[PDB]
Amino acid sequence: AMGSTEELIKALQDLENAASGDATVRQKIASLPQEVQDVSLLEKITDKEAAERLSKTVDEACLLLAEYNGRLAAELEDRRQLARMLVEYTQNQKDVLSEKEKKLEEYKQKLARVTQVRKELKSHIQSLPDLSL
Amino acid sequence: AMGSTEELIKALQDLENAASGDATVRQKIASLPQEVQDVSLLEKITDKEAAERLSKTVDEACLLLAEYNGRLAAELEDRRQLARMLVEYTQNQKDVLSEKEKKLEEYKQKLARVTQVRKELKSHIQSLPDLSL
């Protein structure tokens, strides 16, 4: 049901497998030769044989980064949903808290009253005939 | 491991199973006859024997209400602690949110620089000799 405790737990648990693939591809990008991102390095290629391999390297870095940016974008959208979920839920919990407090004060009233009948009954139990005699 | 997603999941699950015993003891208290809580009913007792049966009844209503109020006061302290956890956690999540936003924006920056190298490379390759005669 929404937006209940189980909902929140499931959404909380899908943050675990939001890491996973993270730091590895993150290290592939973390590296990446400087030649694939600095255009000013291009003047140093004086060989078509070398220039064509930078071309292929560059191509696949382009694919790595595009895919990763897609995953990151999705994770951020998920985090915003999880945020709204948390906020709605803490907001509901404050209500539940207020009502439970009231219920408890109602049961303390009931306990007081029962306690009162108890005390006065101890008095009232004498003052009556023990008709066995 | 505090505090921390794992922490919150555990505290979250210990909320479902605090309502377990609820509705039955809650229902026994609900049906507590008026004779054990109204001191004004005591004068309708004109027989020591009926007053003593009442005395016993009253007594066990007293234990039912005291133990239930103890569990309830405890539940309320746990909910207040969960409140504090939920709130600390939504703040740390807003932090993580901002850092992930900046991180991604930096990876889109890197994507653009790579993109620029791709184009200038497509131009710069026909500027070199295909040595083959």
Task: Answer whether A89 sits within 8 Å of B86, measured CB to CB.
Answer: yes
**Is the Cα dihedral B70, B72, B78, B83 positive or negative?**
negative
For B72, the closest chain A residue by CA position comes to A104
Chain breaks in chain A (C to N over 2.5 A) after: none
Q: Which long-range contacts (CB under 8 A, 24 or more apart) does B47-50 make?
A: B47/A128, B47/A131, B48/A125, B48/A128, B48/A129, B48/A130, B48/A131, B49/A131
Distance CA B14, CA A74 (A): 31
Distance CA B42, CA B51 (A): 8
Q: How many helices (H) and strands (E) does chain A have?
A: 3, 0
In 3D, which of B4, B89, B3 has the Cα closest to residue A85?
B89
Q: How many domains does chain B have?
A: 1
In 3D, which of A70, A62, A52 has the Cα closest to residue A29?
A62
Identity of the residue numbered A69: N
Which residue of B48, B100, B115 is in closest CB contact with A128?
A: B48
Distance CA A126, CA A15 (A): 69
In a 10 Å sphere around its CB, with 0-12 CB exposed, 13-18 middle and 19+ buried, how is residue A125 labelled?
middle
Three-class secondary structure of residue B46 per DSSP: coil
Distance CA B3, CA B8 (A): 7
Q: Please provide the distance, in angstroms rounded to a whole number, between the alpha carbons at the two ends of chain A.
A: 67
In a 10 Å sphere around its CB, with 0-12 CB exposed, 13-18 middle and 19+ buried, how is residue A67 labelled?
exposed
Q: Are A25 and A64 in contact (CB under 8 A)?
A: yes
Task: Give the CATH number for residue A71.
Answer: 6.10.250.2560
Task: Answer whether A48 sits within 8 Å of B117, measured CB to CB.
Answer: no
- The alpha carbon of residue A60 is apart from the nearest alpha carbon of chain B, in Å, by 10
Distance CA A133, CA B7 (A): 68
Distance CA A129, CA B46 (A): 9
Resolution in A: 2.8
- The length of chain B is 133
What range defines the domain where residue B127 resides? 1-133
Distances (CA, A) of A9 to A58, A94, B47: 42, 18, 59
Distance CA B23, CA B30 (A): 10
Please give the method by which this entry was determined.
X-ray
Helices marked H in B1-129 — which ranges? 5-13, 22-30, 48-125
Interface test with B, best of A32, A57, A65, A116 (most B CBs within 10 A): A65
